[PDB]
Amino acid sequence: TTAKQAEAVEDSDINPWTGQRHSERYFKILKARRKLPVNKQRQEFLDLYHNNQILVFVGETGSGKTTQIPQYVLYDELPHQTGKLIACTQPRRVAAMSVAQRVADELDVKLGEEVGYSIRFENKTSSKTLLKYMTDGQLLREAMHDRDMSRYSCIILDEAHERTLATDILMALLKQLSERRKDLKIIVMSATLDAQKFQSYFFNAPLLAVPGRTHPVEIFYTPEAERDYVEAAIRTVLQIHACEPEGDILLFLTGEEEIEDACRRISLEVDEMIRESDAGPMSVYPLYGTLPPHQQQRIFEKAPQPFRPGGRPGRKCIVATNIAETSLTIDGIVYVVDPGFSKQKIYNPRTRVESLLVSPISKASAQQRAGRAGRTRPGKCFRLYTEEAFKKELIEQTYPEILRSNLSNTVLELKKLGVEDLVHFDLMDPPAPETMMRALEELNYLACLDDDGELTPLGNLASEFPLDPALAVMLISSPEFYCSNEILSITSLLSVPQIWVRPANARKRADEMKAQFAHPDGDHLTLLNAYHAYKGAEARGEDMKKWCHEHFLSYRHLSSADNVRAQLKKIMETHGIELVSTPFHDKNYYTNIRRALLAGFFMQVAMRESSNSKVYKTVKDEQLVLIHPSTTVTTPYEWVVYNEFVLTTKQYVRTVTNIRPEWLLEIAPVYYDLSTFQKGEIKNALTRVAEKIRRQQAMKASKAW
């Protein structure tokens, strides 16, 4: 129970968890581990853990705080083994999976056995699991079925400073739960030191702070901004690899596509650089949210060394998103390239505009990025933006995600959790009252709540799905349109990255191939066609990776979509939701699907303003939009249902499907209650089609007597 006793247990020959003998790797890694900053304060941790129910832990990135602390807890409760588990929550998937693998290696056990991870649609655990690294959202969803979280004896909320939505809701739930369950330990971990609010919130909880031990980082700035930050970044990476000593490079970018393309171009220009120059070898690794486990783990490979000793220093380049900002640490990094951008989620209430958007980072973010370089040795950060700009463009911190998000899912989850008074829920930072209200009416239109604010059977059923309320409701309602299977496929496809691949060498081909999958009526149906082609090839016995390459489709994203589809399907079967399909010979096959979309996306509809323009106008928001140029639809109809709302230089809607206005009035009578529309073109059009519907009811057949 004391620190040295725990160490002596760790030092033993046999593995206490598996009854097998420890490997040499285990002792190598152990001896390595005990050099970490958190180690020398282990005892001080244990004390604080032994005398307190709730504890606040604060340390810099690279301390050991995520990999070591759960293990400290594990070995501490080892002598009196409890039947419950240890949960560590990471706001980022990749962090959870990667760290799970690491701690698996440190405990000398198989991943998914004693140490396991839990992500939405990705479960690497079993009955053997004592330590689970999960996404905070995943734990939040577990709480909905288990309000007291009876399977956990200790819960470690990690990376709390990121102030994500699920983390905050979890903090509230756990504050309220610490009063009921005194047998539950709670450890809140952070990187930013200002956790006095965390203390005050959790009944003045104690604080353990690890002294920062980062080496000095020298910060470099450009003279004047460079418009295209990507090639700036690439030329920077090249200039470093050619004109600097030993070390590894951390290059921050925005998303998957940018990262892959940049990796490829860097690889090319480095390859040519080898044949012509003094520059040594350089391996390049991508790092982003959707990346599969193997490719995640490949970033921890060590750099290649020169062809001949004494010169040509070789190295690694990690082209990562802001995951590498604070969530995880890579050793060997000495240089950091910071273009100053990240993909941030923004939400405007009034305009109802929810969107992902590449935007300027925060001052705090910038400082973290710079900080990573000076861990092992003193390092330098190349910031592409100007110093003056740094000083006065950059917001000082990224505001709480709660403050900038759609709270429909949140309110649904809270209702499922039993919260009967939302506007008093003791969250750390209460959301804007009008925003949460908007969540309430959005839930009202989906018929997930009754007039008493309680869950509709449909709402309760919707909470059982790992989906946004709209998507969930669409899926659940689909049997009424006699196309549940197809809507399942489409839900799955909508829940994974885009499936299209467009390599630089084969663009014209790729595009054309994409066009071959195109359905005339909409993008959802195009996705459906591609997926069906994929399943046909799979059934036929084809090599699906080769088939996907050959057809310019992402095998990763498609297989992922199939995984998601499987899980959603068995959730559907559990709760008695019918799986039905219209015979393809029927003329209503596609119309049933297009209509089925309106069950969940009746609020994301736009109307073409005139024939003299390609401009569409959203319903009840009066937002001017264009159909995104990445459409398989060559003939957009007057009315469209869109899935996404992206903002670049112009406001786009993405993944649109042609619909008939009558369907809006039929499937969505309450929301398209015409008397609740403002004066304008949309109201007039819908009025005309309504009056048209009345003419249609020419029949006077019912009269009986």
Ligand SMILES: Nc1ncnc2c1ncn2[C@@H]1O[C@H](COP(=O)(O)OP(=O)(O)O)[C@@H](O)[C@H]1O
């Ligand atoms: N997947 C991994 N493979 C090898 N080493 C790792 C891995 N993840 C983290 N580490 C090491 O563990 C140390 C502590 O980092 P970690 O505990 O993951 O996060 P935190 O910064 O919260 O402590 C780092 O110095 C890093 O070198």
Ligand SMILES: [Mg+2]
């Ligand atoms: Mg960590």
